Amino acid sequence: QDWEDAMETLNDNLKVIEKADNADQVIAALLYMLAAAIAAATATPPKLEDKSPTSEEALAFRLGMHELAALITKATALAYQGLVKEAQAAAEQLKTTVNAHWQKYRS
């Protein structure tokens, strides 16, 4: 379970959420995303492979992954309330923040 694997899991579950039809499928997908976001914050992306883990740059990376976890959790709260369309809209929005982090640290 490396960083790219966690990012792939985020991508795959975003596509599941977009096609889902009920709250339970959305919530399951968001829980898998939350697990991947937490895992990604413990992993080292390509751009940081030889950086000091206590560097400001590495801390910023980990905080960015926590930002994703916060957005995923808020979308989970919406879906738990039965606001499924709202949770799907929230997932579509956080896709862009996930993409920002993916593009910043990949390769």
Window of 6-14, 24-32, 34-42, 84-92 that interacts with Ca ion by CB under 5 A: 6-14
- State the binding string over 26-45 for its own copies (x if CB under 8 A, else -): -xx--xx-xxx-xx-xx---
Q: Which does 106 bind (CB under 5 to 8 A by kind): Cl ion, Ca ion, its own copies, none?
A: none
The reply on whether position 15 binds Cl ion by CB under 5 A is yes
The reply on whether position 85 binds Cl ion by CB under 5 A is no
Q: Which does 8 bind (CB under 5 to 8 A by kind): Ca ion, its own copies, Cl ion, none?
A: Ca ion
- State which residue, 42 or 106, has the beta carbon closest to its own copies: 42
Judge whether 29 and 17 are in contact, CB under 8 Å.
Answer: yes
The reply on whether position 8 binds Ca ion by CB under 5 A is yes
Q: What are the distances in angstroms from CA 36 to CA 30, 56, 97?
A: 10, 23, 15
- The residues binding Ca ion (CB under 5 A) are 2, 5, 8
